[PDB]
Design a protein that fits this description.
The structure is a homotetramer. By secondary structure, chain A is mainly β. Chain A has a single domain, classed as Avidin-like (Lipocalin). Chain A has no helices and 8 strands. Chain A has an 8-stranded antiparallel β-barrel. Chains A and D meet through strand 8 of A and strand 8 of D. Bound molecules: biotin (2 copies). The site of one biotin (BTN) has 16 residues of chain B, from strand 7 and strand 8. The PDB classes it as glycoprotein. The entry lists the keywords beta-barrel, biotin-binding protein, glycoprotein. It forms a tetrameric assembly.
């Protein structure tokens, strides 16, 4: 356990984060399955650092919606010795007009643990 | 619709280049920041993300800084302004690498930037 | 130092008025927003907050919207620009009232605004 | 238990939030005691809504520091029937120059429970 993000993860909302083999340069791909909404299987792409307790970020391209979410976070080993992802996210909604842009960005935080 | 391809700058003078956009909305490119937290030499850094292929597309991307242990993500939407020029309204989160879990709370900065074409 | 007292506007046309500043940094005033989530009639709403009484003061405040169940908080810093005019750089969180705990995650919007004096 | 914010609260960082009697118009005052830093007793001022499951916000004026934090959130009764504050916050640090403003705002989330 050294925070190679590869594998399946869940958050408290019940969403599933599936991350593939991390490339030599830290790039990864995967799949996001969400139970909440403002059933979707959506692709993601991002990067992780190659260090101990890596930082990372990724974008989910929500299927059948005009929204996008980005997450960024860092992986740590908790007190019980297990890997936890601490994240914060921005959820962008599509606005009809430029003047409505101020309303288009939600923010939040979630922790992921392994399935 | 927008064409996120090409070169953009923000008010800080940072340069965003989107190299290619695929039919699934995925894109790749580079980011050259005019500002940093670190005292290390800034270098061009890679990015990956997605856009919607719609009118006034939303998009998001991650920059994997080549010169620090940080990561930044942006998400935003492209509009045409009054003059009919393309503008990307974005907000971003900058993650710094913390030493221990107990310091996690200090690790995330937030901000906004608007990108335009090079004048 | 800045004098946060008086009238300010942001790029959306919203009007921030700071009525008074006490020696402990506490201030009160009102906010009139040019934009809202609701379709209800916008009305002037009260605010309370604090500034540092330093050069280039940081500050924060909360607006208790009079016409909705939302709350917004801003925090920022005052600088002098190139022309020697006062500017407040802020970021804000807008909390909307959610029906149930399970919807909490949808409840917080974020953004940035800069405020200047009335021209 | 109907989310009158009055009383003592703690978050997972071990900070203490002390909120006084809420006024007729929803305004409140109080005191914030933090264990983390970038011992402080600091004043706060803010407002709560007068509704069920009230939203709220407040500013803490950190003693002996040039920083400010604002929180905004909503109070709910959890599954065990107890009051929880779900919050997000912006922490502003004082920058030396206008050009450094981009680096001055941290963001986060915390949940408070009663002491
Ligand atoms: O110093 C680091 O650790 C990485 C560089 C951070 C650059 C930040 S990220 C958000 C903001 N927008 C930019 O044009 N650059 C900065
Ligand atoms: O509609 C509501 O529920 C309350 C009005 C929200 C106004 C928002 S808060 C942040 C942003 N800055 C402004 O000048 N007004 C909007």
């Amino acid at each position: 356990q050294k925070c190679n993000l590869q594998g399946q993860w869940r958050n408290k909302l019940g969403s599933n984060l599936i991350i593939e083999s991390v490339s030599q340069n830290g790039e990864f791909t995967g799949t996001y399955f969400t139970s909440v909404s403002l059933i979707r299987i959506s692709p993601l792409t991002g990067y992780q650092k190659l260090t101990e307790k890596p930082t990372f970020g990724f974008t989910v391209h929500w299927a059948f919606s005009d929204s996008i979410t980005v997450w960024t976070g860092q992986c740590f080993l908790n007190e019980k010795g297990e890997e936890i992802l601490h994240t914060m996210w921005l959820l962008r909604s599509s606005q009809e007009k430029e003047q409505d842009n101020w309303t288009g960005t939600r923010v939040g935080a979630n922790t992921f643990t392994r399935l």
